[PDB]
Design a protein around this ligand. Structure first.
Ligand SMILES: *Cc1cc2c(cc1C)nc1c(=O)[nH]c(=O)nc-1n2C[C@H](O)[C@H](O)[C@H](O)COP(=O)(O)OP(=O)(O)OC[C@H]1O[C@@H](n2cnc3c(N)ncnc32)[C@H](O)[C@@H]1O
Ligand SMILES: *Cc1cc2c(cc1C)nc1c(=O)[nH]c(=O)nc-1n2C[C@H](O)[C@H](O)[C@H](O)COP(=O)(O)OP(=O)(O)OC[C@H]1O[C@@H](n2cnc3c(N)ncnc32)[C@H](O)[C@@H]1O
Ligand code: HEM
Ligand code: HEM
Ligand code: HEM
Ligand code: HEM
Ligand SMILES: CCCCCCCCCCCCO[C@@H]1O[C@H](CO)[C@@H](O[C@H]2O[C@H](CO)[C@@H](O)[C@H](O)[C@H]2O)[C@H](O)[C@H]1O
Ligand SMILES: CCCCCCCCCCCCO[C@@H]1O[C@H](CO)[C@@H](O[C@H]2O[C@H](CO)[C@@H](O)[C@H](O)[C@H]2O)[C@H](O)[C@H]1O
Ligand code: SF4
Ligand code: F3S
Ligand code: FES
Ligand code: NA
Lengths: 254, 239, 655, 254, 55
């Protein structure tokens, strides 16, 4: 620790006598890191929902992620860097957003009761963010580590494998809804928290931002389930005991 | 004895809009058997008479003079410079107590307040005739009911409790201790669930994360270690 | 203007000040309690030895009673005290100690079986019966021919202060630490309250109330070497004197303790000796029944100390870079009788003296320790300024005279608090007062101005140099042995300083939480209290109790059987106005004679002394032949008055 | 919510006017669930450190866990029940022990500074519990899910596979130290929190409990690393491209 | 007995009662202001029309 660390701690004010700016720098990254994951999760819902377009089209995109058109025909260690990275901005978010958590018998019991008595939409949707947020502590960790340790096992055949042969569908099914509610609301609540859209009738904006939230995440919940049943079927029809599907190589692997 | 000493002191006056949290170095030549009570005093009579700090008994039994000496809460009037290796001594006011000025904090009224919180006083139902005789107690009961009435309300086990520094409604070791001091006193007719109503919440005994920092720094050497644990064992099985 | 009212103020949250507030608040009177520092940190906490009560439970406290305690007290007073007060007291201590024990206070109690006493010589194996198991125990103490000094280890004062303070908190009393009284409010010789200065915020408040009690503890700090805490500066004594209407009594009667760990001045109990531990000289022996055969130790303060300076003045003072001194060997007093019951007085020795107690003898040396004198009051507590009461080392109710008896001060604290309490509640609940806004304002707006002058002061005196110079003068010339010439070079410099103390200059201008400004308005008061003792002593030409005058060594009964009533009538004057008050021999339950110890036959005798004695023995023997109990005879010799609640006689063990 | 839920929330006292007992029932399970995992983790350090005793001895114990001597030669779905279970008592612990977390700029900054100034052993060892505790939110989740989805992939050859061929050693190396410090201290702090050992000199007990903690966890940190380097070596020497080592079956699989 | 003093009492924290207390407190007079219900909830708040001033 520094001397201005001791001082700010023993008096509650910076050595130059002002309230630390920290709480602001922190309330910025909680929203900051939160927005990031929010979008990567829509992009990831497309970079991945390409399995509803021939094993070939999908197999294509999985390569380009590996910069085949620069590094040979494929480079898996490059994806481990996107995971290893989007795994860091995963942790950072949790660590800064778990501060906003209920935490001791009272804060919990009181908040709950209130939620139920009130029956307030937006106040109830928070809860959900705070619920799913916990859940992803366990679920999301598995998945993220993998795309960082077996970046080659990702293709139209090898990915289908993991899905049923290693059993991720029990998980991808739960996590599929969490990451889509926590992401959806999170963004709506983020648009009203800083209100970039307010305008000259911020009452009508919060009105559309609230309905738009829905359609946009109702579309991603169906499309997401379609993309789900796809690798599941593709995973069922893999009975040849004489093939490593997990590593169903084509050239620069698979 | 004759060696030079470097005294780093904390300073800030919450009521002067122009005061800023800073340090102040003073240079005192050591003397033999020199307790911080002396050092901190010379600094006043001679060097700087702006320094605020509280001393009373100077013997180590009033509990006033408590402060952060080189990172550890302890009694100033009973701390020697000799024991300070290299020679640099930093002084900070006890944390977790309403600051007043530099090294002076309000140890008092928190205790005169926690005392009230735990209802600190014999809870008998009827009085005995002060005229007639006295209540017979095993000489060995009145013995232990002593070692816990010894708490001198100094603040050190509140200043060291990392818990109380974060969550601040905590009762503190010195509080839990008190509660016991009365459980085990015969003249007091309070039951266990009576005590559960005073300290059976996450701000009470339960908020204690057994860091055992209090037990190690108590200038009077009490059994906070086991005692706070004992209390726990009961309050947790209550009702 | 900021004013706060209450039915009964209480300037001084000491041990006595609190007890008092308990007896008032318990009967509807809304009370307040000002105090420099939070109460449980008072100076009482630092009480070692114990509380003395004519109890009689222990095999040694055995057969004890009011009469014996009474005598033990009176003979110790070297006959300069008020007999009927010492009487009220003794008959209350017992029921006082019981109340305490019922409030929590854990008194080390008696255990069935054989003990291992040390006495003077050595181990003697004492045996407590079995009808004593569980009763408040006792210790042998200074100048007692009976073991009536009660204890809870050697940190007795502690468990008491708390047990009481805790009680106030239970009743809703209002404690207001870091608040100091700096002047009393009187109009037509009546006390309406006080002017207080919030030590923190720094602003002046007027605290008005029907009654007003002052319990500001001793003034031992006017001396350089004292055992008293650094907040025992007698400011409280000073402000009652500054009203110029009430008077301080025997201000020159200052008691000195024999074994304060030298040079720090940190006390080292008398339980050292009462538990068997004894004083080693410079040769290293026992100047004990050497100088006085009835044991040097277990003799009054003024006694056991005197010669401690004799051996030294004969050049036999085996000093250090600070001064000559002696040692106390309790190394032979067991490591259980030391590691307990002399527990503090062992840690005290390791943390400061850097040595072990059950090992060696300590570098001790007599220094000031108690302050008999103070605000003079009548028997019911009130003073000359009708409305202002007092109690505790702070004042002079005078059950002490010229020599308090070990273990009496913190018995007087609770006792006096119980008694003077009932008389304080009575006053406040009845007396009606005429509070005037012009007066209130006059005092407050007047005190505020005072503070300002001090801040805008341009003089160039270092209050810390004037302050420290005062403590030098006192400890030197007004030491244990005083003499005409030296109590003159003193009464003079002390004055020359009260005149310099008005030309002081502080560096810190702030009007709040200013410690320097504090020592600026505090010093002048100390000096005025200092002049009262120095001059008070200079005038009193004779040797009585703790007042040893090398030039008037005889306890004059014919001229000096009075009390130095010091006042300060005018604001300007630089010297107290000493008037004397005479004592009535025909009211004494015990007439002026030999004190049971000290130097034999050294008191110029008074004629009525004897005559009174004869007719004491007359009445005595007659009512004994008549078959009258000791209470009937007591009643005869001299009747004393008590409050209702504390009338009944104290039931003892075996009646 | 119930009516006594509303009432206890709006007044802060049970309908019968008493302080909820909950906080006690809760402070019991935080320690409760904590003790469980603490021991399972010593037992798991042995049921697993048997790989330093022939591939055969180890391969043996992996079967019995599958109740071979009741259900054929092996039953993997039985292990998924030990994981699925010790995965529930994993979550419960986190959820009840994260209440004891620093949580907002101040509680963090203040505690930290204090920790460093003080330099107090036991106060510093807590921090560590609160640190490792977070970490295991991410690490421990992967591993636990697996032993619940691929309970057959556990043997002397197949387990070695996962270690290097799927890359868990980067993880098992981190987690290996967390679960061993958080477990070690946790137990020492648990013994002094309730002080079952106090006795007649609880000052000497806390003295041994403090040193014993060490040896017991210094032994498990070495033995644990030995058991580590074992599956690593065994995992390096697996170059036959014509074998599924992950599923290196013997009879009732492998 | 419970007694509380102040240089100038003000029974009624209405709209007028408050203005008054402002002109006293602004010049050293320690003042108090009793009131049935918190001041800003007085009956003045419910004023519709306006304030008339020969402006
Ligand atoms: C100093 C000392 C005294 C002592 C003793 C050992 C030492 C080192 N050992 C004793 C023993 O073994 N047996 C015994 O009987 N007495 C012993 N004593 C002395 C005894 O404790 C005292 O005589 C007794 O406690 C005095 O009564 P009291 O309790 O009232 O007074 P205090 O403790 O000195 O406290 C003074 C209080 O008044 C407040 N104060 C002082 N001035 C002011 C002003 N101006 N305004 C407001 N408040 C004031 C003090 O803060 C304190 O609370
Ligand atoms: C009722 C009303 C009045 C009104 C108005 C519309 C309505 C519905 N529209 C007005 C308008 O357009 N233009 C206008 O000029 N005046 C209008 N008025 C009336 C006007 O507001 C009042 O005449 C004026 O406010 C009265 O002065 P004041 O502000 O002092 O008094 P108050 O608002 O009635 O509040 C009384 C206060 O005294 C306290 N109180 C009352 N009794 C006690 C006792 N016994 N003890 C202690 N405190 C007391 C009340 O609580 C309150 O604070
Ligand atoms: C598992 C770790 C996670 C935890 C612990 C967590 C926790 C939280 C919590 C409690 C909030 C704060 C609510 C507030 O204070 O207003 C929140 C908001 C949000 N989170 Fe997460 N979250 C997690 C993962 C994710 C992921 C993977 C996404 C990706 C879709 C995400 C996107 C968001 C968004 C968009 C917000 C809005 C932030 C803001 O209000 O500024 N979170 N999260
Ligand atoms: C850089 C790291 C990531 C990559 C490259 C990646 C890749 C993939 C791929 C290829 C799949 C298919 C199944 C498989 O092969 O195992 C998938 C599915 C999934 N991913 Fe990710 N992912 C990443 C990050 C995330 C994150 C952070 C979340 C949000 C917490 C997430 C949530 C999901 C879910 C729930 C599915 C299911 C899709 C569905 O069935 O609709 N992914 N991911
Ligand atoms: C990843 C989830 C985990 C979290 C969030 C976590 C968190 C905590 C925290 C902060 C404490 C409480 C300290 C206190 O209040 O005194 C603690 C204690 C402890 N934990 Fe964990 N822990 C986790 C996993 C584990 C695991 C896997 C073990 C197994 C070795 C374990 C064993 C313990 C033990 C023995 C205690 C003592 C509990 C007590 O003081 O009563 N923890 N944990
Ligand atoms: C019922 C579920 C569990 C079972 C049956 C199990 C099984 C195993 C096995 C067989 C391995 C070897 C590597 C592999 O095959 O992947 C292993 C290693 C490991 N396990 Fe577990 N485990 C369980 C629960 C836990 C838990 C809850 C923790 C603590 C958070 C844990 C921590 C570890 C660690 C760090 C290692 C490394 C061992 C070393 O190298 O010393 N396990 N586990
Ligand atoms: C949304 C979660 C927020 C992140 C996690 C940390 C904050 C919230 C938890 C801290 C407060 C503890 O909260 C306390 O937990 C215990 C779980 O054993 C709950 O216990 C209750 O719900 C659980 C779960 O449905 C049941 O298995 C249990 O039988 C029931 O009694 C208490 O009703 C709750 O008040
Ligand atoms: C032990 C963790 C406890 C569980 C997690 C929740 C409680 C603790 C965190 C809540 C308080 C937030 O705490 C705040 O976090 C940010 C991280 O962006 C820290 O930020 C600081 O440390 C991080 C991590 O080493 C650095 O990358 C960063 O550059 C630095 O400025 C703040 O100094 C801290 O005060
Ligand atoms: S309990 Fe110990 S540390 Fe706490 S106030 Fe008392 S003596 Fe000091
Ligand atoms: S150190 Fe503090 S955290 Fe609890 S165990 Fe003692 S009171
Ligand atoms: S100064 Fe009195 S106990 Fe330290
Ligand atoms: Na006196």
């Amino acid at each position: 620790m520094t001397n201005e660390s001791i001082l700010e701690s023993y008096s509650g004010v910076t050595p130059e006598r002002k309230k630390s700016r920290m709480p602001a720098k922190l309330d910025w990254w909680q929203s900051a890191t939160g927005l990031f994951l929010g979008l990567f999760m829509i992009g990831h819902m497309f970079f991945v929902s390409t399995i509803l377009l021939g094993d070939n089209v999908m197999l294509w995109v999985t390569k380009k992620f590996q910069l085949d058109f620069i590094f040979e025909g494929g480079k898996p260690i490059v994806v481990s860097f996107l995971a290893a990275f989007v795994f860091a901005v995963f942790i950072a978010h949790a660590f800064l957003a778990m501060r906003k958590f209920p935490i001791n018998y009272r804060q919990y019991l009181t908040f709950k009761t209130h939620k139920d008595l009130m029956r307030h939409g937006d106040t109830t949707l928070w809860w959900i963010q705070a619920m799913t947020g916990f859940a992803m502590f366990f679920l999301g960790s598995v998945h993220l580590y993998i795309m960082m340790t077996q970046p080659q096992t990702i293709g139209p055949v090898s990915s289908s494998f993991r899905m049923v042969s290693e059993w991720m569908w029990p998980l991808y099914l739960v996590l599929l809804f969490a990451v889509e509610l926590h992401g959806s609301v999170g963004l709506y609540r983020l648009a009203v928290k800083w209100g970039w859209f307010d305008g000259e009738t911020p009452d009508k904006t919060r009105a559309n931002l609230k309905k738009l939230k829905t359609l946009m995440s109702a579309f991603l919940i169906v499309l997401g389930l379609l993309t789900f049943g796809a690798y599941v079927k593709k995973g069922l029809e893999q009975t040849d005991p004489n093939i490593d599907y997990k590593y169903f190589d084509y050239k620069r692997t698979h | 004895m004759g060696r030079m000493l470097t005294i780093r002191v904390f300073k800030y006056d919450p009521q002067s809009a122009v005061s800023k949290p800073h340090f102040q170095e003073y240079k005192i030549e050591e003397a033999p058997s020199m307790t911080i009570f002396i050092v901190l005093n010379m600094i006043r009579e001679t060097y700087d008479p702006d320094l605020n700090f509280d001393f009373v008994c100077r013997a180590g039994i009033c509990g006033s003079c408590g402060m952060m000496i080189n990172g550890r809460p302890s009694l100033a009037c009973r701390t020697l410079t000799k024991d300070f290796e290299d020679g640099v001594i930093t002084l900070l006011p006890l944390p977790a107590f309403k600051l007043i000025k530099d090294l002076s904090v309000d140890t008092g009224n928190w205790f005169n307040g926690m005392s009230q919180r735990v209802e600190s006083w014999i809870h008998a139902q009827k009085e005995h005739d002060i005229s007639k005789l006295e209540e017979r107690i095993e000489p060995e009961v009145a013995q232990e009911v002593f070692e816990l009435d010894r708490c001198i309300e100094c603040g050190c086990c509140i200043a060291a409790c990392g818990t109380k520094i974060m969550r601040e409604d905590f009762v503190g070791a010195a509080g839990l201790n008190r509660v016991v001091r009365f459980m085990i006193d015969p003249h007091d007719e309070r039951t266990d669930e009576d005590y559960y109503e005073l300290i059976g919440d996450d701000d009470g005994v339960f908020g204690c994360m057994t860091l055992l920092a209090c037990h190690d720094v108590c200038p009077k050497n009490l059994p906070l270690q086991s005692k706070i644990a004992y209390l726990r064992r009961k309050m947790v099985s209550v009702n | 203007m900021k004013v706060q009212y209450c039915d009964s103020l209480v300037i001084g949250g000491g041990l006595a000040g609190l007890r008092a507030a308990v007896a008032t608040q318990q009967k509807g009177l809304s009370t307040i309690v000002l105090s420099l520092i939070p109460v449980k940190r008072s100076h009482s906490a630092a009480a070692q030895g114990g509380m003395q009560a004519s109890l009689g439970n222990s095999k040694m406290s055995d057969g004890d009673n009011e009469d014996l305690h009474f005598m033990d007290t009176v003979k110790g007073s070297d006959w300069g005290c008020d007999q009927k007060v010492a009487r009220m007291f003794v008959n209350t201590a017992p029921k006082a100690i019981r109340e305490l024990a019922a409030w929590g206070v854990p008194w080390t109690r008696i255990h069935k079986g054989d003990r291992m006493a040390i006495i003077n010589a050595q181990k003697t194996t004492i045996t407590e019966e079995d009808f004593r198991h569980g009763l408040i125990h006792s210790r042998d103490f200074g100048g007692t021919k009976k073991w009536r000094t009660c204890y809870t280890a050697d940190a007795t004062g502690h468990t008491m202060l708390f047990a009481v303070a805790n009680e106030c908190l239970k009743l809703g009393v209002s404690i207001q630490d870091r608040k100091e009284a700096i002047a009393l409010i009187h109009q037509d010789g009546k006390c309406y309250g006080a002017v207080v200065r919030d030590l923190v915020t720094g602003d002046i408040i007027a605290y008005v109330a029907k009654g007003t009690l002052i319990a500001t503890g001793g003034y031992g700090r006017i001396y350089k070497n004292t055992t008293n805490a650094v907040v025992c500066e007698g400011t409280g004594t000073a402000i009652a004197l500054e009203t110029g209407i009430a008077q301080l009594g025997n201000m020159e009667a200052v008691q000195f303790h024999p074994t304060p760990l030298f040079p720090s001045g940190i006390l080292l109990t008398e339980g050292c000796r009462g538990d068997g531990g004894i004083l080693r000289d410079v040769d290293g022996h026992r100047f004990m029944p050497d100088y006085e055969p009835e044991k040097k130790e277990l003799a009054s303060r003024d006694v056991v100390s005197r010669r401690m300076i004799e051996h030294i003045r004969k050049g036999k003072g085996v000093q250090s870079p600070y001064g000559q001194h002696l040692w106390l060997d309790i190394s032979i007093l067991g490591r259980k009788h030391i590691e307990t019951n002399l527990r503090d007085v062992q840690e005290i020795c390791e943390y400061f003296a850097g040595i072990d107690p059950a090992e060696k003898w300590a570098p001790v040396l007599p220094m000031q320790h108690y302050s008999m004198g103070g605000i003079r009051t009548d028997y019911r507590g009130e003073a000359k300024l009708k409305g202002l009461f007092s109690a505790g080392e702070a004042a002079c109710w005078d059950m002490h005279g010229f020599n308090r008896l070990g273990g009496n001060s913190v018995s007087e604290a609770v006792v006096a608090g119980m008694i003077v309490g009932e008389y304080f509640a009575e006053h406040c609940a009845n007396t009606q007062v005429d509070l005037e806004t012009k007066t209130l304002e006059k005092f407050v707006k007047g005190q505020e101005a005072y503070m300002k002058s001090l801040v805008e002061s341009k003089g160039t005196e270092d209050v810390f140099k004037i302050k420290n110079r005062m403590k030098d003068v006192m400890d030197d010339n007004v030491g244990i042995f005083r003499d005409g010439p030296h109590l003159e070079k003193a009464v003079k410099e002390l004055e020359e300083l009260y005149k310099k103390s008005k030309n002081v200059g502080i560096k810190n201008k702030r009007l709040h939480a200013n410690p320097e400004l504090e020592e600026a308005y505090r010093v002048p008061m100390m000096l005025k209290v200092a002049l009262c003792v120095a001059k008070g002593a200079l005038d009193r030409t004779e040797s009585r109790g703790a007042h040893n005058r090398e030039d008037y060594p005889k306890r004059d009964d014919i001229n000096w059987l009075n009390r130095t009533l010091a006042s300060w009538p005018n604001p300007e004057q630089t010297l107290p106005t000493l008037e004397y008050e005479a004592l009535d021999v025909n009211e004494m339950e015990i007439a002026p004679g030999y004190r049971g110890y000290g130097a034999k036959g050294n008191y110029i005798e008074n004629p009525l002394s004897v005559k009174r004695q004869e007719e004491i023995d007359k009445i005595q023997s007659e009512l004994e032949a008549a078959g009258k109990d000791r209470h009937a005879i007591q009643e005869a010799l001299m009747p004393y008055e008590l409050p209702a609640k504390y009338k009944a006689r104290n039931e003892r063990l075996g009646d």
